[PDB]
């Protein structure tokens, strides 16, 4: 699986 | 008073900004529409005008997909920008904060993405609307370029990657993934 998760 | 000479600065720090910037750094600059999102820029030069006095910053513009001629598209990342033909000079006090424009590759490798992190895979032309490169890699049956925001999954014969929604599959499907085979196989 491919993903870059954005959290801030 | 009388005025001091003009000087190109190694670095500049602003009390309102509270952060110190140098050439080569990427910054967010307030657009004249305050509600509007920040411009992303790369600092080519910082200079002080003795007359004001004030500090001027020579910036090369990073365009957002929605600022591009083509407009935003599906495969365009949220934090995606294009390095552009466009140069300008702005006030030093229009800078809200520093930011980072990563390589597409390095952005993909990022563990977590904050509002500071961006990526670039495209050079851009402001007048013509040309892109460099004119095309990149494509995936799935939609045969579209990759959006790092979205989730894809790999397989065997294809060993390609797929959006679940593109093939009936669940977002939830691939978590419980023993493994993947697709019809083309
Ligand atoms: Zn396959
Ligand atoms: Zn797809």
Author numbering:
A (entry chain P): 3 to 10
B (entry chain A): 3 to 187
Q: What does the literature reporting this entry say, word for word?
A:
In Arabidopsis, the BAH and PHD dual domain-containing proteins SHORT LIFE (SHL) and EARLY BOLTING IN SHORT DAYS (EBS) function in chromatin-mediated floral repression and seed dormancy. Here, our biochemical and X-ray structural studies show that SHL is capable of recognizing an active histone mark H3K4me3 and a repressive mark H3K27me3 independently via its PHD and BAH domain, respectively. In this study, we identified SHL as a dual histone methyl-lysine reader that is distinct from other reader proteins in recognizing both H3K4me3 and H3K27me3, two well-known histone marks with opposing roles in balancing chromatin and transcriptional states. In contrast, the SHL from Populus trichocarpa (PtSHL), which has similar PHD and BAH domains and shows similar H3K4me3 and H3K27me3-binding affinities, successfully yielded crystals.
We determined the crystal structure of PtSHL-H3(1–15)K4me3 complex at 2.8 Å resolution. Single amino acid substitution of the key residues involving PtSHL-H3K4me3 interaction either abolished or greatly reduced the binding to H3K4me3. The superposition of the two complexes yields an RMSD of 0.94 Å, suggesting a nearly identical overall structures. The binding between 2-fold excess H3(20–36)K27me3 peptide pre-saturated PtSHL and H3(1–15)K4me3 peptide yielded a binding affinity of 27.6 μM, similar to the binding affinity of 20.6 μM between PtSHL and H3(1–15)K4me3 peptide.
